[PDB]
Amino acid sequence: PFATIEESDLELALQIAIVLLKVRLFSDAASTSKFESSDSEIADARFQINKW
Amino acid sequence: AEIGGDHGYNATNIAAGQTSGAVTQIGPAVMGMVRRAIPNLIAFDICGVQPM
């Protein structure tokens, strides 16, 4: 990828690729076996509270 | 995994609610108010009591 894309800025050049099907967004679900092998790095959720 | 944390036992932070982890407190509680006791009076009948 980024071969025909000549744009210098990294962010924009990446953005060109998404439309042109070169790269693909990987926001995607996980295969069922990933959370069963007893070694499953399960993502964590964090929260914070501040007072004004 | 979002530890509770606690104030550093430094009176400056404990009143303000500045904590070490998450969920800064609203503020301290209110256990009440104490006031200096009123001294009692010595009876005036020792000296002559003539209302002028």
Rounded to whole angstroms, the Cα distance separating B7 from B15 reads 10
> Cα dihedral angle (B21, B22, B23, B28), rounded to 10 degrees?
10
Nearest to B23 by CA among B6, B38, B42: B6
Q: Are A20 and A1 in contact (CB under 8 A)?
A: no
Q: Which two tokens stand for residue B3?
A: 């530890």
How many angstroms separate the most distant Cα atoms in chain A? Answer: 50
Are B22 and A44 in contact (CB < 8 Å)?
no
Q: Which two tokens stand for residue A45?
A: 């959720």
The partner residue sitting opposite A51, judged by closest CB among B1, B2, B17, is B17
Q: Which of A42, A46, A49 to mutate to test the interface with B (most CBs of B within 10 A)?
A: A49
Angstrom resolution of this structure:
3.9
